[PDB]
Symmetry: C3
Subunit: 182 residues, 3 copies
């Protein structure tokens, strides 16, 4: 009930398979003075090693068809087939604590301007009178109102978030827009 392999103290002992003259795979204690135990394909160069404080495989690791990658990323059906890094980015609001100017100029009553970021469901700050930032969080394309410094601004988000239009304002003309980074 035991196939007994015996070597001298601290000497290698492993099972080696060769097909033809080719080293194919091995399992066991591959080196003298080293107690790591390895299961290795020479042909694939793919390895599992039992080491002192952990086990390791040297390439990506599949669990069924889910994948644990060598960079620590995970892919599987639970993440909608995405890698986890992308699932997270798409799924949850980023704590960037940074903003970006998407537009600068002057947009009086009736004037529509155009930006290269989708402004829908974003945190924005609009600068109108008195060199202050007026906060707003947009929903989808639509009509919004803010009692911005100077008086007030009624504005429209249109064109799938790329259009920003001053519908009407009372002494509160937008001259800059920042957006919180995603």
């Amino acid at each position: 009930h035991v196939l007994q392999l015996e070597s001298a103290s601290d000497k290698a002992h492993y099972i080696l398979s060769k097909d033809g003259n080719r080293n194919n795979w091995y399992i066991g204690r591959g080196s003298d003075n080293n107690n790591d135990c390895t299961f290795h394909s020479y042909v694939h160069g793919t390895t599992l090693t039992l080491k002192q404080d952990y086990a390791v495989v040297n390439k990506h690791f599949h669990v069924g068809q889910a994948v644990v990658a060598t960079d620590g990323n995970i892919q599987g059906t639970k993440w909608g087939g995405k890698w986890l890094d992308a699932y997270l980015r798409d799924s949850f609001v980023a704590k960037s604590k940074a903003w970006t100017q998407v537009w600068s100029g002057s947009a009086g009553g009736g004037v529509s301007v155009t930006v290269s970021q989708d402004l829908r469901f974003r945190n924005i700050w609009i600068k109108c009178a008195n060199n202050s930032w007026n906060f707003f969080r947009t929903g989808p394309d639509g009509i919004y109102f803010i009692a911005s410094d100077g008086g007030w601004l009624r504005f429209q988000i249109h064109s799938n978030g790329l259009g920003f239009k001053n519908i009407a304002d009372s002494r509160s003309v937008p001259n800059a827009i920042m957006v919180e980074n995603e």
Copy 2:
């Protein structure tokens, strides 16, 4: 120092254990013309394979007591014993970029209404005068103010977020409330 297994080129070579007449487990290169090396239980049908570009197990994979599931979900004490998908959902604000109406009507000064979701710590838009949406983010049940289109609205979130009351308004009567999806 080596147990040497030798085969013809590209022929299977493996070690097979049988208990009585039952195939029980094997290790090695299980098939001709295929360099994949496998450690397999025939009884359990549970397998580790070393392949060209990855190593793979065919069922859920435990690391101590933590679990990496075949769908890519992970369970562990670091996630409070939850699966990671649920930890994430519970822990972080959802980037849903979508909204839902929670009430529609007319709530003049003093009028209280029931809303369809708990509005505490939520992103909301209230429509009052002039067909525009006024943004607000609520905290707990309490008293809030917004200089909404038309003038202003002092409002109350009550009844564990299920009640919305117009305390007072100046020419700014609410008629619709949207909430950002969670």
Copy 3:
């Protein structure tokens, strides 16, 4: 079958390959125990083990994939997470759904008056109480000048000193007396 290394045992009895160096049990592979079909690759010296069981495979210690690590508490470390553990990457990268708030200042700051607040208020959700006992919401950006038509009239305020300073620049009948912040 003459070119397979065949290990044959009685039904439901252990059979494994054991390697010993000198007198020391060093490693084994196979069916370690009677009446039990679990198959194990184990180092006796390291005490590190892989086991194939009925419904799962298991390693008994942290498991590395290249240099990435899946720990026994379910945490993951890797270059994708900036070399951080995923728990910290998540905490640092994404907005907490805390649904709770904390008071960061209480007092009375009229026009021109500046106060110290107890948290960095940059890129935070805050609520300022001015006139009429109501909360006025604002989300801040970095240090800078901001405006809110808060209950009473309006308030132009400044976040300064790396988020630790709050100054009433000017107000119209809307003097701040308390500020709450959403918990991170």
